[model samples]
Target: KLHKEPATLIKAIDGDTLKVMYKGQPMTFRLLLVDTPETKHPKKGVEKYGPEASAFTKKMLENAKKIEVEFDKGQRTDKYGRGLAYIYADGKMVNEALVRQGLAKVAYVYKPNNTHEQHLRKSEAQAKKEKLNIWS
Candidate 1:
């Protein structure tokens, strides 16, 4: 359990990122080991399934019974200034949830913080078999 401070998921900025309130301050936490299609991408514009992913993420965050941050590998933040975290909602890994639901895919190799890569890949395999959401 890498659980840390309790946080309120203020908003799901996208499938892969969120704005959360941690310790009386607003912080952005980017989901580790996953990336959904772009709702707002400079080169690609809005991609198909992007809206669904975003909506699903919003709902997950909004409805989370409990949310916590897990910062491992001693890396606290990303280059763009967002916190690098494995966020949990009610003790469930939300990053894996998105991948399991086919709202996201395994992406971006950040080896130092790649703790859940195997689980993410497993969920992705199962989703592919079910042809759920983006997989369908």
Candidate 2:
């Protein structure tokens, strides 16, 4: 069993960014350990496979019966003030799901925030081996 806090999905901005209600306050959460292609970036427009990634995230979260956020031991907020957390929908960890499906790749790893680094890396390797989506 992993540690987690319940949350409500408010909006999914893209594959890697989401707005959620935590403890009654709405805030953006930058999904930790994975970076999907850019769909909402002002400068990047849409990158390869970006729309697919974003759609998958939205579909997963919006259809989930439960949502959760897990904070890392390192910094909880990025420089932009967005809350950094691992998102879970139902029993699935969205971060790892993204990587497992080849919708995202492991990136932006930092200090004590690496609780699931190995797990994500393993998913990424399997995805790469299977040549799914981004890995393809």
Candidate 3:
């Protein structure tokens, strides 16, 4: 709860991206340290499991009783100016769930912002071993 702040979900942009209201202002949050298959990349279009990941995230946030955002100890924003934070829905970390479900991969890990790196890595490993979704 160190840097966690209550957030209002505006929309789920994709699996690892969200539009939320933080501190009374609308902001885009790029789930820290996780990357999901692109649902709508110009060249790639919809990758395998992309729509599944997107739908999963959308349902998770839309049905949550409460939403929250947690900032890492280091960088708080990405190059695109989107807030780099961990998303929590109803006390569960959605970012970790995505990896655990094999919908996301642990990527772009940087120091200080590595707050939940260990947890995420463990989830990804288990998911990979089970060959879930992306791993499949």
Candidate 4:
């Protein structure tokens, strides 16, 4: 059940999702705990902050020195069939970096899957206090 597993970042779907190649296969991941502003929505259209959030995600993924995706406790995949995970690279967590920079907000909370809720919430609070990019 184990081999040379490494995630090759292929695309940043948004601040909270990525399409990657893991062990030579493609996979989609929905980040754990937080959600970005909506870029693709049928009813809501795109939020004002959506593009910035997407850019933030893209920069993180594209510039990453390494990428890692770790799944959750409640489940591994969401209803939309995307894998639910925490992404890390460049000595920091991509999810937290988005919230910390005010490019995203704390969202998609299900208590059972709230592994990084506290940390994500804390980052949001700090971002709000400083009125960083999106918060400003």
Q: What C-alpha lDDT does candidate 3 achieve relative to the native structure?
A: 0.91
Provide the clash count, candidate 1.
Answer: 0
Q: Write the per-residue lDDT of candidate 1 for residues 1-136, one digit (tens) a residue.
A: 4556689878888878899998889999988889898898779978988998888888878898899988867578988899988888888888899999999999966677877789899999999999998899
Ranking by TM-score: 2, 3, 1, 4
Indicate the residue-level lDDT of 40 in model 2: 72
Worst 10 residues of 1 by lDDT: 1-10
lDDT of 4 by residue, 16-103 (tens): 7789987688889888888688788569869878888888888978998888776666787888888877888765788899999898
lDDT of 3 by residue, 67-115 (tens): 9888988888989999998889999999999999999999978898998
Q: Each prediction's TM-score against the native?
A: 0.92, 0.96, 0.95, 0.89
Query: In angstroms, how far off is 88's CA in candidate 1?
Result: 1.1
In model 1, where do residues sit more than 4 Å from their true spots?
none
**TM-score, model 2 to reference:** 0.96
Greater TM-score among 3 and 4 belongs to: 3
Indicate whether candidate 1 or candidate 2 has the larger lDDT.
2
